[model samples]
Target: ANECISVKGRIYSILKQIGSGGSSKVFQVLNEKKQIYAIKYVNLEEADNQTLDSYRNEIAYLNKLQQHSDKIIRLYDYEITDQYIYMVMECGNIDLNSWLKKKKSIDPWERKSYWKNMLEAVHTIHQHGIVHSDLKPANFLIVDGMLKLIDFGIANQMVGTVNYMPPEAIKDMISPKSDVWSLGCILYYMTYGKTPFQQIINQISKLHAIIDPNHEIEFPDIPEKDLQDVLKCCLKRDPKQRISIPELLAHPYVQIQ
Candidate 1:
């Protein structure tokens, strides 16, 4: 029963369960042709309308991003059934978070490479009027040394993982700059081993502080002045003060070869 899973009318051989979340599970599967793919299955019976809407919204955004950038995750196909919805996507070697845990520390050049690629991907989506809403290590995948952004289920919306969300996102007012704050959190996590507000015990406390205009964030000793400067610009509490994607791309840290 675990070996084969039916989606719509097609049967796929499941290799293994690679990941799972609150509302869905991802598996590595093989088609009859022996092609490898990752499929995400949502149990419709257990999912609320918001979850279903988010799944459909992700497909719509991924289709648009497919034409504009190669740095975004590729959606191969989708299937709908009475009790489930399945999304087939390109399989990646590993997600950034797992890669980070294995390596512990990345080379300076490699860090720059990853950041540049991610910034470009975000910039591309922004040009198309989509906000990633969530930009965390777990949402990025590395395939053959290229960083690809994944999980746009909440893009152009206010829903996102609490740790990666910006102040505006909590208020249901998300913008491209909101992504900048999330990106800053990722950068902070990359340099350190945890998110900036990971110390806060209460979710509401973190949200309140993030929304306060005067709340300032402290960074670990990043060694690179240019990188620190870029992080500061992105982590501004006020979206108006946050750096834009284009400006971020032009920053010294991202421009480094």
Candidate 2:
């Protein structure tokens, strides 16, 4: 319900509210020039200092990252007026979450194509010396038939989402290895249509047991043994044991050569 009138010099007409969370609301809006964009309005009054800082951090990160090629959602401009902080970003097509919900299973070749794009984008981010804290399906966007990483709103260089988060993040205090763990989880989700650690456990004993080496575990019935081995390597609990992005790109399943 916020408008960027003063800064952009034209009324940003609201088309519809696309998303909302604790600190802000995301609206699909149109500027007077008829350009479509995703505008995030951060309600300063409702948000605490920490939330506000994250908002600023997100904008700063986007500002630094906007000049890259077609790998991410492009951030155009930002504004802060009397009432709110507004960020203007590219409007992507359907996200991977919506796409997955529509089609229960993607064909093998489609999976391969999607994984290749994902790897390329994530590898680009890593090359810039940053980590995508959240690498889940919902954060991946399909724009004009190509996949792009979207919503770096919560992404910090090393910090990650708790559940989809890497165990090494907790053990080693955040690192690129954590992102590698999440990337592996994402691959598992693509192959199996579910997360390996979907359920939450109240008891630490059960939690440790599931991630522990001695416990027998069940893997999804994926057809490719080489791909399954790659997934297992990514999901390894030890950060040092996990493969790097370069190594993953060179793996049998991903190697272009």
Candidate 3:
């Protein structure tokens, strides 16, 4: 038997499983109009307090910001059932990870457009007080060709996929700058083939290298430090030292009409 769920008093048939993380599962569902959407339902009983808290914050923030900020993932509807939390969201064609793998590469000048879009995505959400504790490429979806940020966790957990996380994140403390650090890692991946700190030896050692202030993060030997400068402003050891999103938008290279 096919599974169907009701949101906003409308029925949607869950067609296929699209994504999964931890215990939550995201499904591709279709409405009566044949409009496609994504739905994530997590069992309340199965979730710990941290996971439930993340769900609460994401649903709350998305509802508040979805109408105001185009850069944030749009929440179609949500409901808190006794057994589960069901959230329906706009479906996307692909995430940044798959987009990059398929696109192969992007022109340096063309790169500025994507960077600006990504920065604007975070900037819009950060402006409204949402910290995407998880800011990796996977969470950034390409919706109608524009980048959008998803998954805001109030708890600074997940240690955030290790390498993309900030040094301070190890302390389980985070600021908006923590997102900036992951943003820098994403850009570094776009520019280079892998994360700035290559996964060496093992996760623990790789974690140490990423957090070490003494470790070097090298930029490409290309001319015009505009992009390089942006990275430097983002990947600083001190959160206070990192460039704010407003300042990031002001950079000579990032600003484009």
Q: Which candidate is the best by lDDT?
A: 1
Order of quality (TM-score)? 3, 1, 2
Q: Can you write out model 3's per-residue Cα lDDT over 1-257, one digit (the tens) per residue?
A: 68898887989998899887666788999998979999987767766677667767767877887776687788878889767878888998888888887777777865676788788778878878777766788878888877787766553232345778788887553888888889898988888767777657487877778778889888876564777788888889888888888888898867644
State the lDDT of candidate 1 residue by residue for 154-182, as single tens digits. 62222244777788777764789988888
Q: Rate the local accuracy (lDDT) of all candidates.
A: 0.81, 0.71, 0.79
Q: Could you tell me which 10 consecutive residues in candidate 1 have the lowest summed lDDT?
A: 152-161
Reference-based TM-score of each model: 0.84, 0.81, 0.87
1 or 2, greater by TM-score: 1
TM-score of 3: 0.87
Model 3 ranges with Cα > 4 A deviation: 48-51, 155-160, 171-173
| lDDT (Cα, tens digit) per residue for candidate 2, span 1-257 | 55553335557778888887666788888888878888877667656567667767767766776576476777777787545888787887778878987887878777777777777777776777777766688778787777777656353221223446666554443667767777787777778876666654544544564466775435865678767887888888877888888888788887642
Ranking by lDDT: 1, 3, 2
Better of 2 and 3 by lDDT: 3
Candidate 2 ranges with C-alpha deviation above 4 Å = 1-7, 46-50, 153-163, 170-173, 199-206
Please report how far candidate 2 places residue 65 from its true position, in Å: 1.8
Candidate topping TM-score: 3
